[PDB]
């Protein structure tokens, strides 16, 4: 049965939805593709390599906005950057997770360095530029995990009615929105006391 | 070997250095406590009711910053209370993963019920006093799994020396400043456009 990297991806990432990413295995995977152990190993070393496969798939997949458009602001950028990230971990079951565990990859940086090269033209240092990423990332990356982890007191339940209705988006669209203005303030300031 | 339950959590907390989040399980804390695992079981019924009590121990134990100070800012409080969170998280191995995977508890809502008292009568609506809290949460939580997680192009390289050097701390207090000021930024518009 068909062991083509591609093929063997894509079966792991069904494998993913249905079993998270404890449950998927090896193991299991080898009795989906139709084949013994030894011959998904020759293939698939272990778990790990798995996983670090997933990561980058699911984000070549789906992370559509990761390059700037030509003229766009620093501010759009960061904003449908994230946007799209976080759709991306959203797609997938324990998606978030297999982004965490995995260290990144050579196009990641490549792409990334293009981002970076983005900032330090538009006024950022470099270690700014970098930060500015990476918060909007932890941001992002803290918005999901909860979000894909869960499925008294008055005051808390008085505001309970827009933890449900809503997915998370307005409260991530809002605090997205927070973070960048407040990233802004930090960069026009150069510094005079700000 | 004595199983009050301040003891068991107490081997479970040094069983989490030892192993992590994964490796813990209930049939190697019995072997932990010099006790066989029907004797265990009595007193934890599994994995699941385990973490949580570590969960809401390590906060316990830790995060002494949860309540503001009197006639403290909201800004302060925010900052304080992150920053006590995240040296809680750092405290033990996967820690931001004990407490990702747990429910919150039957303290944890009174304590946030007074801060969210402290949001509302600082200006904040309720569902806004909620988020802000939420978002600072986000972020600190992303910073810490990313930071616990993990242990080519010139730019990217040659911001790196402050990837390594600093453990994260610097980079998390600069992103910390910038996301409170974006949320104060938004309170005080009220709405003007902003
Ligand atoms: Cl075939
Ligand atoms: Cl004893």
């Given at each position: 049965?068909?062991?083509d990297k591609?093929k063997?991806?894509?079966?792991?990432?069904?494998?993913?939805?249905?079993?998270?990413?404890?449950?998927?295995?090896?193991r299991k995977?080898?009795?989906?593709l139709?084949?013994?152990?030894?011959?998904?190993?020759?293939?698939?070393?272990?778990?790990?390599?798995?996983?670090?496969?997933?990561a980058?798939?699911?984000?070549?997949?789906?992370?559509?906005?990761?390059l700037?458009?030509?003229?766009?602001?620093?501010?759009?950028?960061?904003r449908?950057?994230?946007?799209?990230?976080?759709?991306?971990?959203?797609?997938?079951?324990?998606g978030?997770?297999?982004?965490?565990?995995?260290?990144?990859?050579?196009?990641?940086?490549?792409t990334?360095?293009?981002?970076?090269?983005?900032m330090?033209?538009?006024?950022?240092?470099?270690r700014?530029?970098?930060?500015a990423?990476?918060?909007?990332?932890?941001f992002?990356?803290?918005?999901?995990?909860?979000?894909?982890?869960?499925?008294?007191?008055?005051?808390?339940?008085?505001?309970?009615?827009?933890?449900?209705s809503?997915?998370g988006?307005?409260?991530?669209?809002?605090?997205?929105?927070?973070?960048?203005?407040?990233?802004?303030?930090?960069?026009?300031?150069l510094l005079?006391?700000?």
């Amino acid at each position: 049965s068909r062991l083509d990297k591609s093929k063997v991806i894509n079966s792991a990432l069904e494998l993913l939805n249905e079993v998270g990413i404890e449950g998927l295995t090896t193991r299991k995977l080898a009795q989906k593709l139709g084949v013994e152990q030894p011959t998904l190993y020759w293939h698939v070393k272990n778990k790990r390599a798995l996983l670090d496969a997933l990561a980058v798939e699911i984000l070549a997949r789906h992370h559509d906005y990761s390059l700037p458009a030509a003229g766009e602001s620093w501010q759009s950028f960061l904003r449908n950057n994230a946007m799209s990230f976080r759709r991306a971990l959203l797609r997938y079951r324990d998606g978030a997770k297999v982004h965490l565990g995995t260290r990144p990859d050579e196009k990641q940086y490549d792409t990334v360095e293009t981002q970076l090269r983005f900032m330090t033209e538009n006024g950022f240092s470099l270690r700014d530029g970098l930060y500015a990423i990476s918060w909007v990332s932890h941001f992002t990356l803290g918005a999901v995990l909860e979000q894909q982890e869960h499925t008294l007191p008055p005051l808390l339940r008085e505001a309970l009615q827009i933890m449900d209705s809503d997915d998370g988006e307005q409260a991530f669209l809002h605090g997205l929105e927070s973070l960048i203005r407040g990233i802004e303030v930090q960069l026009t300031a150069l510094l005079q006391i700000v």
